[PDB]
Each structure stands twice: as structure tokens, then as C-alpha cells.
Amino acid sequence: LVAAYPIVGVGMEKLIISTNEHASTDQGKTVSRATVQDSNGESWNTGLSINKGESAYINANVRYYNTGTAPMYKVTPTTNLVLDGDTLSTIKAQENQIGNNLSPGDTYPKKGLSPLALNTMDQFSSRLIPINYDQLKKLDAGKQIKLETTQVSGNFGTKNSSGQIVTEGNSWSDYISQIDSISASIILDTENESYERRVTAKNLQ
Amino acid sequence: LVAAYPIVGVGMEKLIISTNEHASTDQGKTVSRATVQDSNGESWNTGLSINKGESAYINANVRYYNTGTAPMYKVTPTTNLVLDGDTLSTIKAQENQIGNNLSPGDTYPKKGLSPLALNTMDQFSSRLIPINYDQLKKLDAGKQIKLETTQVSGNFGTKNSSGQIVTEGNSWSDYISQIDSISASIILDTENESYERRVTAKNLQDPEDKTPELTIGEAIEKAFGATKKDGLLYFNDIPIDESCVELIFDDNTANKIKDSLKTLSDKKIYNVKLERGMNILIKTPTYFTNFDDYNNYPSTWSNVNTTNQDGLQGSANKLNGETKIKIPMSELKPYKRYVFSGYSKDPLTSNSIIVKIKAKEEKTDYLVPEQGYTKFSYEFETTEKDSSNIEITLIGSGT
């Protein structure tokens, strides 16, 4: 009467920004002789430029954690970056930000480790995620961002007649809403942990 | 009852950085004639520039190694680069940084070789991994980085009816957590190697399952191939007793053993019933003092007496005197927190001179509880390459 239904959450650790700024320094020395007169000049050239359109790159620190009564193989979340009552981007994680295993009642990575990075928006890990100039002015003026869990995608394992189990095509998505139409969601919160369970019900209609 | 479960580790060797800097040098020569006047000028143009956004490329030197009881075909790790309480990037290795084979108890590449490079972040080997300017200033200001193992992906082989084996789709990931929910993690650490094993357990909560359970001493005898020699356990003629090694428990495991010990009748931590979720470290000692035999010591002690020198539980001399051994720091590794641990006796007063510099030169009296045998242990810090020695001295009146 209790169904396996793992809950995934994403936690924010730190945010790093970076500017795409352009500097230069030149020194020139000229001399001239003419017939009697001469000249000798020394010139400097400092240079600083910035071109909007990919003007501020960022990276975020995350860590995944489980809650519930199931493992979650090959997990992949998606995130939605807000800044100030708005949105900035929406990212499904690439191959490098995948999570292999997630035991119920555990975090990814393990507890004696450091968090995880994400910095690119393309499908293959290129083209670091940019922020335009007005959001940079909102950021340095005093406003801060947060993170947001939207959906995940993972797999379960099931044993065949051969004795071992397989994880291919056995998505967890197509048992989400079905469970969420038959069950009540009961959550417990203690002083250190939290637990989310789905308990089956009976339609009286 | 022991499951194939290979552990992969990534080791840092060297880090190389590189700057995306831009230089130029121009020379110009002009002449002019006018009607009578002339001119002739020679001009130089030095130029140096740097544009942030892909301003510092890097590359890292790694080597893979196995530990456990399984091969790992077509291994692929992922790495997570920290700099200073932060992160820089996370890389799953491309096709060029793959590892084909990894025998258990071995490294990739083989031992008579050089390490491996990684320099790009894209899926196809382009777009070398950049570091922006502030991290470069943190780096050249004095701060350094390290590496971090996060996950791996590999394959196992299984034979069909055709007689040969195949490695396709047989991932090791979907047998990770299942094993990690049925087993206790027991790790051994000797002076050169380390071994991580998973031993199956029995859930005492639900009784419909019939898993043949055992105790922790039998678990060590079954996990490694341990020869029961005369009651003791021996691994490659190395003694592993409850009194001859150093055990390490984490607080949940230590608390579970500590509550389950009082309902037990015997004061031995090899006879405790194994439980489900445990992390148990065992470590060998460097220098052992069985006064009968097997004493890897440069000099031998003073005021010795050979009456039932059997190790524990039979040490049978209670007299006066002194023991002393001096050992310089040249034989041992510097800058490491060494731990010195022994047992008790029935004297009335005894004190221990541990005179090692850069460390705890506090010397205390024994405070003997009774004639029963309990342990005692101190910690200290190793100095750097001194013939100025650590001189252990035990003065006793009653032993």
C-alpha cells in the first residue's frame, strides 16, 4: 500500500560570476633626424573595452539529494534560474553533470566531498551561459538569485529470467502522475531529516 | 557472500597552466623631401594585450587505479575541480581519456609509464578549459588546487551459450547501490596497499529472508582470504588480531557496536554480530612489539624478562625498572600524525617519555585501573628529517 516514489531535490551552495572584459597596453618609441633638427617621442596606449552580447559568464554549485523509498539510477534534473521576479535560463544538465546513483536517504556526492559545478547551456559542453548587462547591474546593485527544482529523469532496475537486472528504457516519469492520482502525499519533518511518502487511497465515488 | 564491486580512484600528478597573451612588434621607416628641406623618421611599436574570456587554459595529469575484486572494462570517470572552497568545472572524460582495461589491484597506465593528460571540456576534443582572471590571481597569489573522484562508468563481461563473452550494455552502475544497501563496507589498509570489500549482511527486522549471517572476525576471515593460524588470523603471513591492529569506526557504527557490546558477555570486538550499514576501517601498525618474536625494531628494549611473553592476557612480570628505545626521524615519513597505542598491566606507577619535537612532549603517569588489560593511545605530529630522535621511555614500579 506504499509505493516506491523517490523525491529529488537540488540545493544551492555558491554562485560565481565572471566578466568578459578586454585589456591592452602598448608602448611606442619614435625618433627622427632632419637636415639641423631632431625629435624623439615616447607614446603610451592603455586600452579597455567590453562588448555586450556574452558579457558576463557564470557558474553554479549544486548537490543532489534523495528522499523517499527508492533508488534513482542515472538521474538528470532541470533547473530554472530566477533573478528578480523573473527568469534567466532553464537548463537540463548535460552528460558531465549527470548523477549515476542515488540511494534513498542520501545525497550526491557523498558527505565527505565537495559540491558540483555547472557552467554551460549547450547540449555538448560548450558556450558558457551568459548574462547581459542589465542583470549584471541588478546583481551588483544588491540583488541575489536562487535555484529551483522543476523535474527529474531517472531509471529503475528490474530482474529478468536471466537473474540479473537491467536499466534501459525503464523511465520513472511514466509512473509519476499515476501514483499522484491514487495517493495522498504525507510528509514528515523531524529536526534533521524530512521524508515524503505516498500512501494509496480508495475512491468512494 | 563477497560481491564483485570494483573501486576506482583518480590520482593527481601535475598541473600545467597557460596564458592566452598577445604580443606584437612593428618597425616603420619614413623619409620625405620638399622644395630645401628633408625629414627621415624611424618609429617603433611594441604591443601587448590580453582579453578576458578564455584568458587562461590548463591541463591536468591523472592516472587511474583499481582496488577490489573485479575488472572494469571501458572505464570513464568524472572529475570536479576545486580551487579555494569553491568549484571550477566538472568533466566527464572524452573518448581520448577513456581507459580500456583495469585489472583488480592495478593502475592505468602500467607502472613503467608516464601519466595521462586532460585539457578540454567539450564532448569532442576542442575548446580547451579556460580559467578567468580572478582565479588566476588567486592561483599566483599562493593558492593551489586538487582533484576529486565523483563517479565512474564501466562494463563487465559475461559468457553466452556461444562460449565467448560480451561487453555491451552491461553497466556497473545499476549494481552499485543495490550492493550498497545489503553490505557492510570493510576496508583494510596496510603499509603499501589498501583494499575495499563489501560483505553481505542479514536484516534482523524482517524475518522472511534467510541470509546466512556471521560475525565480524568471521567476516574478515571470509572477505579477504585469511588463514586461521592457531586462533590468530593471518593475511600473507601478516597477523591481524583484535589486539594487533588498529580499528576505526564512524560514530553510528561505533555507537551500534557500543550498545550491542553490553548485552554481549565477552569483551571482544571480533565476536560481535555483523549488522547492515557499517563502515569499518582496519589498519596495520608500522612497528610491533611482541617480545617473543616478530618485532620489527631497530634496537631492542631494556629490562626484559621472558615469562609468558605471549602478547595479550599473559604478560607475567611485575617488577621495577625502565625500558627505553630511541629512534631518529630518518626511518619514518615526515609531517604525519602518528598514533602510539599499547595495553595495561598491574603496576602502581609508570610514566612514558615521548620526547618527539614538534609534537606532544607532555609525559604523564599511567593511572593503572586494575590488573585487567585495557589499551592506551596518544597522538603526535612528525617533524621534518631529524636525527634528533623520538625516545620512548617507560619507567615503572610494579611492572
DSSP for A69-114? SS--EEEEEEEEEBSSSS--EEEE--STT-B----TT-EES-TTS-
Per DSSP, the three-state class of B186 is strand
Q: Enter the C-alpha cell of residue B236.
A: 600473507
Task: Report which residue type is found at B82.
Answer: V
- CB B51 to CB A109 under 8 A? no
Rounded to a whole number of angstroms, the distance between the first and last alpha carbons of chain A is 20
Of A18, A114, A166, the CB nearest to B148: A114
Q: Are B33 and A34 in contact (CB under 8 A)?
A: no
**C-alpha–C-alpha distance, residues A18 and B374, integer Å:** 59
Yes or no, beta carbons of B88 and A117 under 8 Å apart? yes
Helix (H, G, I), strand (E, B) or coil at A170: coil
For residue B282, how many other CB atoms are within 10 A of its CB?
A: 18
Please, are residues A30 and A41 in contact by the beta-carbon 8 Å criterion? Answer: yes
- For A164, nearest residue in chain B (alpha carbons): B175
CB contact under 8 A, A14 and B86: yes
Spatial contact of B42 and A28, defined as CB atoms under 8 Å apart:
no
Three-state SS for B288-328 is: CCCCCCCCCCCCCCCCCCCCCCCCCCCCCCCCEEEEEEEEC
Helix (H) / strand (E) element for A177: namely: helix A176-182
Helix, strand, or coil (residue A135): helix
| Residues listed for chain A | 205
A200, three cell numbers: 494509496
Could you report how far apart the first and last alpha carbons of chain B are, in Å?
46
DSSP B27-86: EEEEEEEE--EEEEEEEEEEEEEEESSS-EEEEEEEEEEEESSS--EEEEEEEEEBSSSS
Out of A16, A29, A101, name the one closest to residue B177 (CB). Answer: A101
Calculate the dihedral angle through the C-alpha atoms of B221, B227, B232, B238, rounding to the nearest 10 degrees: -100
SS3 A147: coil
* Residue that has been written with the C-alpha cell 560481535 in this structure: B272
Report the distance separating Cα A30 and Cα B342, nearest Å. 81
Question: Position B121: which residue type?
Answer: M
B276–chain A nearest CA distance, Å: 15
Q: Quick check: helix, strand or coil at residue B278?
A: coil
Chain B residue with the nearest C-alpha to that of A106: B177
Question: Distance between CA B2 and CA B220 in Å, rounded?
Answer: 11
DSSP per residue over B233-263, as a string?
EESSS-EE-SSSSEEEE-HHHHHHHHHHHHH
- C-alpha to C-alpha distance for A11 and A115, rounded to whole angstroms: 10
Compute the radius of gyration of chain B from its Cα atoms: 31
Give me the sheet containing B239-240, strands edge to edge. B227-229, B232-234, B239-240
CB contact under 8 A, A117 and B87: yes
Cell of A47: 586600452
Chain B residues lying within 8 Å of A155, measured CB to CB: 174
Q: H or E element: which one contains A201?
A: none
Sequence letter at residue A52: K
Name the nearest CA neighbour of B195 among B204, B185, B205: B185
- CA-CA-CA-CA torsion sign (B317, B318, B320, B322): positive
Contact: A95, B176; criterion CB under 8 Å: no
Q: Is B313 annotated as a binding residue?
A: yes
Radius of gyration (C-alpha) of chain A in whole angstroms: 27
Q: Is B121 exposed, middle or buried (0-12, 13-18, 19+ CB in 10 A)?
A: buried
Phi, psi (rounded to 5 degrees) for B365: -75, 170
Q: How many Å is the maximal CA-CA distance in chain A?
A: 113
Whether B292 has a binding-site annotation, put simply, is yes
Q: How far is CA B61 from the centre of its chain?
A: 19
Residues in A closer than 8 angstroms to B38, CB to CB, are: 34-35
Check whether B250 is labelled as a binding-site residue.
Answer: no
Closest to B151 (Cβ–Cβ): which among A32, A100, A167? A100
Non-local (6+) Cβ contacts of B121 within 8 A are A96, A120, A125, A126, B89, B91, B127, B128, B129
Q: Residues of A173-187 as b/e, b for ≥16 C-beta within 10 angstroms? A: eeeeeeeeeebeeee
Using the 8-state DSSP alphabet, how is residue A142 labeled?
Answer: T
How close B192 comes to chain A (CA, Å)? 24
Cross-chain CB nearest to A116 (options B43, B52, B80): B80
Distance separating alpha carbons of residues A159 and A170, to the nearest angstrom: 12
State how far the Cα of A62 lies from the Cα of A40, in Å rounded to an integer.
Answer: 59
B59 labeled binding residue: no
Those residues whose C-beta lies under 8 Å from the C-beta of residue A88, and which sit 6 or more positions away, are: A81, A82, A131, A135, A145
CA B293 to chain centre: 30
CA nearest to A35 within chain B: B38
Chain A residues whose beta carbon lies within 8 Å of the beta carbon of residue B50? 23-24
CB-based contact A20 B53, cutoff 8 Å? yes
The C-alpha of B38 sits at a distance from chain A's nearest C-alpha, in angstroms, of 6
CB B69 within 8 A of CB B197: yes
Give the residue from chain B lying closest to A154, CA to CA: B174
Residue with cell 606507577: B349
Breaks (C-N over 2.5 A) in chain B follow: 35
- B240 min Cα distance to partner chain A (Å): 28
Q: Which neighbouring-strand residues pair with B377?
A: B341
The whole-angstrom separation of Cα B203 and Cα B68 is 25
Name the residue of chain A whose CA is nearest to B128's CA. Answer: A126
Is the CB of residue B259 less than 8 Å from the CB of residue B271?
no
Query: Which cell goes with B122?
Result: 567539450
Q: Which of A54, A116, A155 lies nearest to residue B90, judging by beta carbons? A: A116
Instruction: Enumerate the residues of chain A whose CB falls inside 8 A of the CB of residue B47.
Output: 24, 26-27
